[PDB]
Write a protein that binds this ligand. Sequence first.
Ligand SMILES: [Mg+2]
Ligand SMILES: [Mg+2]
Ligand SMILES: [Mg+2]
Ligand SMILES: [Mg+2]
Ligand SMILES: [Mg+2]
Ligand SMILES: [Mg+2]
Ligand SMILES: [Mg+2]
Ligand SMILES: [Mg+2]
Ligand SMILES: [Mg+2]
Ligand SMILES: [Mg+2]
Ligand SMILES: [Mg+2]
Lengths: 113, 56, 117, 130, 46
Amino acid sequence: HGKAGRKLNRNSSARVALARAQATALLREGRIQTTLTKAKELRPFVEQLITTAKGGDLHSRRLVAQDIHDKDVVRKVMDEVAPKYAERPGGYTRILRVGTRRGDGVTMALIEL
Amino acid sequence: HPVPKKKTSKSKRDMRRSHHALTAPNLTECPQCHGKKLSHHICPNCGYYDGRQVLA
Amino acid sequence: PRAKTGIVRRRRHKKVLKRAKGFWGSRSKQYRNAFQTLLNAATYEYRDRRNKKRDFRRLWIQRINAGARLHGMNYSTFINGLKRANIDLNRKVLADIAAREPEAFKALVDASRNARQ
Amino acid sequence: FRNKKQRKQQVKLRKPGFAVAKYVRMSPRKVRLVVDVIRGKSVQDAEDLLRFIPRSASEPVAKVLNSAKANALHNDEMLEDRLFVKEAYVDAGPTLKRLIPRVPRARGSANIIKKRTSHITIIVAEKGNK
Amino acid sequence: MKRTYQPNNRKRAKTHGFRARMKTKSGRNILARRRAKGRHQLTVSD
RNA sequence: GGUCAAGAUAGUAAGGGUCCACGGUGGAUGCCCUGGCGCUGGAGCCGAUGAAGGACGCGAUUACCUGCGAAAAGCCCCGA
RNA sequence: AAAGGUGAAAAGAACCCCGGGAGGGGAGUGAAAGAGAACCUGAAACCGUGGACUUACAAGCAGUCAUGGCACCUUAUGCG
RNA sequence: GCGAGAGCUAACUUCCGUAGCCGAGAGGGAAACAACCCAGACCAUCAGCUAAGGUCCCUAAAUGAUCGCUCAGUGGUUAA
RNA sequence: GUAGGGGAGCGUUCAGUCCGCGGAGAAGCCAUACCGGAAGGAGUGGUGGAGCCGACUGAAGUGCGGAUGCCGGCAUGAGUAACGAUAAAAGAAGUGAGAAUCUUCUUCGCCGUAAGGACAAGGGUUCCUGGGGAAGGGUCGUCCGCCCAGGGAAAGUCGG
Ligand SMILES: [Mg+2]
Ligand SMILES: [Mg+2]
Ligand SMILES: [Mg+2]
Ligand SMILES: [Mg+2]
Ligand SMILES: [Mg+2]
Ligand SMILES: [Mg+2]
Ligand SMILES: [Mg+2]
Ligand SMILES: [Mg+2]
Ligand SMILES: [Mg+2]
Ligand SMILES: [Mg+2]
Ligand SMILES: [Mg+2]
């Protein structure tokens, strides 16, 4: 009867390379559309990461550099994206649900910054 | 290897299928584009969900 | 020359089938099962036909002794006193006479009493 | 009246509110399930529930619900605000067969069924009682 | 695993061949019999 | 006729059953002949002037059959 | 191996409508489209849709008999 | 069931003799129950008498009559 | 009343003869509460679109529930088990009637004495180009090794 933090859809390694990859893309696009699930999971993972970028030191930048493998996305989050949320108590990310799909019939959604 | 013993009847099978009735979506009129869409979701027609979101 | 079974089997089977009405499921629908049902149906028909007369025998008795017991006799006593009078070959269906007609069966009870003691 | 021969030429015999989709590769049993909620309701409502109902079967049932209303309006001069599904139903159809497999008892148990249409239909009509 | 049938052009031909089937007369028997049996064609075209 | 009490009693069908009505599926049955079957009779061998049976070709358009044959779905003479 | 059937005649359905289509609905032709090319009849299994009377304390070869209830009246107001 | 042999004076045993039934026998009785008890079904009936069996309620029919016996639920598990 | 013997008959096809019926509708098919001692046979209704009852005699490939019988069709299991290797995907962009599945971009993971490359044998246009979307594709499909058309293969020296 598990009472636990994480959900995985898949294996131990992939849960990461995914949450990393989708976080990278949200930061790059500013909103993306994915399954309601992957969205729901991605939400706090990306938020804790905006906070790593807030605070602005090289330490922080190099921490963010661990889940963000593209220098331009990390530069954006660090110099552009982080600061802009300043007076923000934390948690700008939000979940909008678009609707169902054809092939698999799976309800999808927008995660937006 | 554990096979069924008899053809199940027309009445028994139609009885088992008793529960398979689809539950029709409860819809609602969109306050903005006034076309029927669904709760806690974006109106596919106008794109408006509390103000406006998707490019329609 | 060759005579196929055409148009023969079908009429036959429909004839069989048609007896079947409130017949449940394949009994009323598939041939072989229907016809087969109509074998045991034969048994119960004829035999319970001879039986129905036993059944009504039972009913009428069950009524007559009831009226009797109501008036102080019983079937043994009532029919005894009845026969004891060469008078009543009444016998058959006397039940309804007891059911519908109170004072009549009172007179038959009293009378059959006279024919006893 | 006259005789049957004459009854045939005196009347063309129309079909009000009727249209049918033959031979849609789908399962009757399946399509039935969609079609059931549609049945007997306001034709607009019908188009909406049909919009949002997640079975893929729902689509060719939608494509038809219109085509029958379409016939109902244009061909039968009907009044669309009084329109509703009077009836609809799913009748099976000619189960699809390919060239193969043909072989007795050799790796022989498999489907190759690809079941028949269900035929769709939906007769449309006007409210009456209101 | 490895099947019964390992297709070979110079085999399917060196036996079964019209030439081959004509080499002996039990063969040519097979030939003309096959002919009268309807047109059942001999391996060079098969 | 209003609230207590004690009684009895209907109806609702998620789904099922029987009958009826109307479709669908299927292709039996009736009708039919473009195909067979054996009786009787007729006729009865072809091939080194290349058989039987085929291969590949021929056509404005040609994939199957038919018909032919680098003179190729044909060529010349006579008869109708 | 299975193998057949519009129609007397292609008159084989312009044109309109729903649809990418398939498919259908009109129009028109036709004696008939209750023949429309999944084109003679179209049985039975089998799948549905609508109606009638019914069924959610009852042990069951599915019937048979007997009485009551409800419904229907074209060999047919009862003999149903 | 009767008269024997085998057998253990066992067996829903086995082998003969003898009646009767089942076999090929429905109907009533013995809860159920081929053979046992009563009785052999041509057809119809919502008519009557009885057989074996029965007559408290589940089912038809004396919770009958007189004289007793048993106090064990014997009745409704065998003996020394 | 079982094997078995005997008697009367019912129905189906063909055949000869007789009476006939049919486009104001034949056979067949569908419903039915009537007739007959039974096999059965009528009446009216509904379909159907060419043929067909009845009587008398004759001849049979002449009467099906079973044969794990034959062919065909359609059920049950049931919307069940499965969708063919636990080398993962993700977002943007495009097209389109419709895209989780096609296209492009950016990443991610997998093989790398292979899961790269070149031949043989075998297969036979599967290659390329342009179209297509019924079936084939274990879902989808705008896509393909699928369907349509058109192109493409060049040797004194390579192999014969
Ligand atoms: Mg948990
Ligand atoms: Mg790892
Ligand atoms: Mg971390
Ligand atoms: Mg319901
Ligand atoms: Mg037809
Ligand atoms: Mg014995
Ligand atoms: Mg015997
Ligand atoms: Mg038999
Ligand atoms: Mg199961
Ligand atoms: Mg399961
Ligand atoms: Mg597919």
